Amino acid sequence: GDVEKGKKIFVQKCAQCHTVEKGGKHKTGPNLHGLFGRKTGQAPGFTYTDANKNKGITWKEETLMEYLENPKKYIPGTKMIFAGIKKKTEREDLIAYLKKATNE
């Protein structure tokens, strides 16, 4: 996938809840400002369900594309009332954009 597509796809899918671009409004999900290497939760300005937080994994491309398929498998109490973006390809676009948003 592609960052430019990832912009669009992020804005379609995630905008409704998140805006991970330069301290955007933690509306229904926070700024995931720097995912790759991050342990779960860590949202002082938008305290997590603790569920997310508690899993305490390491977010990287895989774990992300995985959770974004199947967030409930990862975190049963995931407060992300969401479809699960079945299409690996759509998720790649997102991980790509993450790699120039939630990264550098």
Q: Would you say 26 is a known binding-site residue?
A: no
Q: Is the CB of residue 30 less than 8 Å from the CB of residue 18? A: yes
Q: Would you say 65 is a known binding-site residue?
A: no
In angstroms, rounded to a whole number, what is the distance separating the alpha carbons of residues 70 and 99? 20
Q: Would you say 33 is a known binding-site residue?
A: no
Q: What is 11-53 written as a DSSP string?
A: HHHTTTT--TTTT---SSS----S-TTPPS---TTS---SHHH
Q: Would you say 14 is a known binding-site residue?
A: yes
Residues within the annotated binding site? Answer: 14, 17-18, 80
Residues that constitute the known binding site for heme c:
14, 17-18, 80
